Amino acid sequence: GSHSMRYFFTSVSRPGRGEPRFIAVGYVDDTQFVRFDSDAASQRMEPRAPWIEQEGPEYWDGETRKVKAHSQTHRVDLGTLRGYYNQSEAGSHTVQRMYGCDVGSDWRFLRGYHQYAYDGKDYIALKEDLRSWTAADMAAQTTKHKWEAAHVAEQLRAYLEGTCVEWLRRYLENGKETLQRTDAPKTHMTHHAVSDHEATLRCWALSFYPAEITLTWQRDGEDQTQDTELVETRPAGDGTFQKWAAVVVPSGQEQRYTCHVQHEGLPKPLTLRWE
């Protein structure tokens, strides 16, 4: 199916005037492959997947130089934003950035992303057309004007539509065995009787990749939302993901309820029922 490359950056100024934290992680789909951590001070872009560790020293030197450039960039941003909003240095603030590209089943470009957040809220974002910006507040409009005069969108578009896509295909090819896999979820249902009157049916999905999945309950073949609980998809720690959906039902009506599982790895959607 479709694939994506994503970079996520977190820059956190710390209380007082110490040195801010900078974190960069790279993903292909739901598989992380690089990282850079100032609290884990090695000063090198580090591999986190076997298919990227085969890249030569020129690649790692290049990414290391670039990730340091990214780090120093956000180091200025924290100070710039401190001025935009009139904030002292004594406080702790967070700058976040994400960018990347999507490709379809044919590995051709689909969409590009390049967006920022400050203290957990939108700051500025490049729209879908990759030519205009969305400024969340007055401060961000200063960035929008500056970046419009410098034609930043035109430069980022070339990277997102070109460079980003070209290197995603290389990553997908080098990590073909593991990046292009689809692990269908291993599903089962459990039954827990709270009392003589109610019972909880939990529908499990385990060891699936990628993370995208849909778990839904139905009663008599009709969607059921009341008396249900759904947890966030969670990582297993071995590259796969987990998720479950529960519903509280009256004793004797368990057979009315069905669990429906949709996943790209499944040949067909799954329907589970308590036997």
Binding site: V67, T73, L81, Y99, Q155
Partner: peptide, 9 residues
């Protein structure tokens, strides 16, 4: 493959 250029807020 990171962006080669940088832009300041």
């Amino acid at each position: 493959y990171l962006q080669p250029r940088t832009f300041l807020l």
